Design a protein around this nucleic acid. Structure first.
Lengths: 82, 96, 80, 54, 99
DNA sequence: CCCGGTGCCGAGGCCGCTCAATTGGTCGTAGACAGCTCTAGCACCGCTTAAACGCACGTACGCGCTGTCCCCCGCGTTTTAACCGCCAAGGGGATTACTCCCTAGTCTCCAGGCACGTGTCAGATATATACATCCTGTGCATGTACTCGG
DNA sequence: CCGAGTACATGCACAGGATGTATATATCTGACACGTGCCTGGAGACTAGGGAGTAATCCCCTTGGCGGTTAAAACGCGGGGGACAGCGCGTACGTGCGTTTAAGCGGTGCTAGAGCTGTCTACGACCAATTGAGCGGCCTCGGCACCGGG
């Protein structure tokens, strides 16, 4: 079949994310909106990380670039180095 | 009769206790490579980088679902709505 | 696919599993220790009458002479 | 607080779950690290009062 | 016979006026006494500059303006024209101050 | 809210001095670039199957409506203090004198950070028994109705 | 025609039993855990040199403290429109079942470039002398604050 990678995030997966988020009842229009916000988030982090990768003259995006993008975005993460 | 929901609820509790990524690895990685392809062509990614992106993304969606659920509860509704999400991100400062 | 013929179901498992069991058709039924049908207002009587069947068989030594409602319920269950 | 959480979990070894319980269960540790995500630590179990049945 | 405007008309008028001008809506001297009271409680024998006090007044008034904006958004999301302490607590909760 | 008059103090332009920016000159060192490599990222393909997708059904939650009760909103009059100028003096800053603390350099030396192999060791999965809650069945006592007798 | 009584129906309480729950236990395994020697980047000790801020005065503005003026805060009132609760209609969101798909696994093959490394070099810190751009200061002036009629 032919399907979009943003559609690759399944409704039961978003449902599990909301269950971990403490959501008992989920509207049908929640899933597409969550895909949109997800795409916005990845467009925000991946832009900065790829920018670090370009400033590093490297063609491979490392985990440190991700940690730094999350750091400048306030998303800073632990366990992957930094 | 015993109150239903039973097993399913038990699996929600156990799946919340045991920690694992709720988004599928290969689809999420295809999405990451697709989004990065627009920024820079012929990019390579580290497994730790993709796993970090999935951790931060899933955590962000969990918190956003928490604030969204708080918006729904403040609306006297037990069901989250795109207006609850938009209000959550609005007060968060991510939009408008 | 229906690679089964005879099965054994528990009394409580028929009440909790009655949702799955009511979706299948059975041409006969056998009941050992049928004294549980003495009460016509019980859920086991209506649950047993809800399933579509042709013939029924109940083998028990219950003393139907004690209460006329027990013998009347056993006669009305097979022949309504 | 991590060793306290491990004793509460009947474990003699500190795990990222115990670290998450120790950091999030403390108010000041949650204020400084609130923007920090702990890997394999999970989150504090929480169920809203409106989500409870009956 | 005495002319009276309907409730909310003068309210929207004040919305347009105070949203129209830049002036500070909190009195200078009482706010200065509050700053000297809190700062006096933290550290004794403190002196202050007029520019510092006016800075505290600007930051405080603007913070309360934004908090009233998000609070009004909480009330409108609650289908109520009146803000409420639960709207304020929700605004600060989603902001992460009291979260 | 818009328009014409007056008015004043803060904006904007000039003067002059000095201290930072600039010009010239040196050392060296981090870096640019090429050489080599070996890890890890990429691609692929098959057995397994858990999760996802689609659909049916109804139950409970959104949502729309209505009604009461009040809790803010607009307006009038009444009371408090914020606000705008003088007058000491208490501090915030210039000016000079001077020392404890750190810089820099060079050996001498304790310490930690891995390459490797070895030995534990909590602790991740599952299974089963013990506990508990309630669902169902049985039994006993009480109440209502109908029939018969006075 | 009314009251007594017998009979049938029924409802509540108790006890048994089934199913859900949770912890106690078992076990093999990834991973902490523990030597064994390496050494090279660190960590400290020991002279010599530098230097900026502590300390004490002291001149000078910017606070903190006096008495009036009206302008805003406050108190009250009245009714009106908005919050909150009750209720019902509808539909959609959840749950279960069956079909479908691609996700997880780990097995193999291949090479791309992040990284280590080795050499040679232009750029900048650094130091000294010279110069004018910027900044405190001062004054003149005009853009907008203030205001009363349309």
């Amino acid at each position: 079949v032919l399907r979009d990678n943003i559609q690759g995030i399944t409704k039961p997966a978003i449902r599990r994310l909301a269950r971990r988020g403490g959501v008992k009842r989920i509207s049908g229009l929640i899933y597409e909106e969550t895909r949109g916000v997800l795409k916005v988030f990845l467009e925000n982090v991946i832009r900065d990380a790829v920018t670090y990768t370009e400033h590093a003259k490297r063609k491979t995006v490392t985990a440190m670039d991700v940690v730094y993008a999350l750091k400048r975005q306030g998303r800073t993460l632990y366990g992957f180095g930094g | 009769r015993y109150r239903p929901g039973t097993v399913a609820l038990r699996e929600i509790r156990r799946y919340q206790k045991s920690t694992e990524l709720l988004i599928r690895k290969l689809p999420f990685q295809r999405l990451v490579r697709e989004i990065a392809q627009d920024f820079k062509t012929d990019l390579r990614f580290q497994s730790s980088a993709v796993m970090a992106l999935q951790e931060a993304c899933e955590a962000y969606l969990v918190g956003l679902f928490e604030d969204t659920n708080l918006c729904a509860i403040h609306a006297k509704r037990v069901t989250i709505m795109p207006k609850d999400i938009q209000l959550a991100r609005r007060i968060r400062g991510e939009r408008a | 696919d229906a690679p089964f013929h005879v099965v054994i179901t528990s009394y409580q498992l028929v009440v909790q599993d009655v949702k799955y069991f009511q979706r299948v058709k059975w041409q006969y039924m056998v009941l050992d220790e049928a004294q549980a049908l003495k009460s016509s207002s019980s859920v086991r009587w209506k649950i047993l009458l809800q399933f579509q069947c042709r013939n029924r068989l109940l083998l028990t030594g219950t003393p139907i002479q004690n209460t006329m409602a027990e013998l009347w319920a056993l006669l009305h269950f097979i022949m309504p | 607080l991590a060793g306290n959480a491990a004793r509460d979990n009947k474990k003699t070894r500190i795990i990222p779950r115990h670290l998450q319980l120790a950091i999030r269960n403390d108010e000041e540790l949650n204020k400084l690290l609130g923007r920090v995500t702990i890997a394999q630590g999970g989150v504090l179990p929480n169920i809203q009062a409106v989500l409870l049945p009956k």
